[PDB]
Amino acid sequence: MTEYKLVVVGACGVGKSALTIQLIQNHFVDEYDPTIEDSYRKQVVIDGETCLLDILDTAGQEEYSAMRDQYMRTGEGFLCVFAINNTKSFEDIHHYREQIKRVKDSEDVPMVLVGNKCDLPSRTVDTKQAQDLARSYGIPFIETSAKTRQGVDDAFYTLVREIRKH
């Protein structure tokens, strides 16, 4: 069956691990070692087609450039994650997008902009600002909460749809 290699990227603390564990195991984790970079496989049905999701949960810049270039080359689609209560994490998105584009040597890479922690009242990044950034990239924007599950399946399935559309 078709396998989609998905990579979750974004600043430390945005909720990459929490989103991944919520997608895979259907539980919210209050803590997951921020330094651990692991991959997980799940069989799912997306738009009536049974497929394998192979998801790499990235740890960040504190590892060999050869490791980061390897997963950016192998990865078919990227979840670019920021937290809605962290403007610095939103400002960082363009850095992740740029690095993926360089490695893949392509102006058209399947990606989804994800604004996580949408359950938190203290928003510092508006939906409008995020939608404008995603529109300029020609990619979807989805707000998620790894805590409540809101938008979690939608964000990963939208990225699979972008790969199928590619």
Ligand SMILES: Nc1nc2c(ncn2[C@@H]2O[C@H](COP(=O)(O)OP(=O)(O)O)[C@@H](O)[C@H]2O)c(=O)[nH]1
């Ligand atoms: N309220 C809330 N907390 C979250 C959410 N996602 C992650 N967290 C918390 O934010 C912290 C960092 O999340 P983590 O998955 O480790 O981020 P990572 O460094 O991107 O992997 C942890 O304490 C998580 O429980 C979310 O959607 N809502």
Ligand SMILES: *CCC(=O)Nc1ncc2c(n1)CCN(Cc1ccccc1)C2
């Ligand atoms: C907040 C995110 C964070 O601190 N991430 C993080 N910190 C330290 C490390 C890593 N991520 C990734 C793994 N390295 C160890 C390593 C492994 C192989 C090659 C070089 C470095 C530490």
Ligand SMILES: *CCC(=O)Nc1ncc2c(n1)CCN(Cc1ccccc1)C2
């Ligand atoms: C994860 C994001 C999330 O929980 N969003 C969200 N939760 C509850 C509400 C809304 N979004 C929007 C609509 N209402 C609140 C509201 C906002 C503006 C005007 C009227 C009502 C519930």
Ligand SMILES: [Mg+2]
């Ligand atoms: Mg993590």
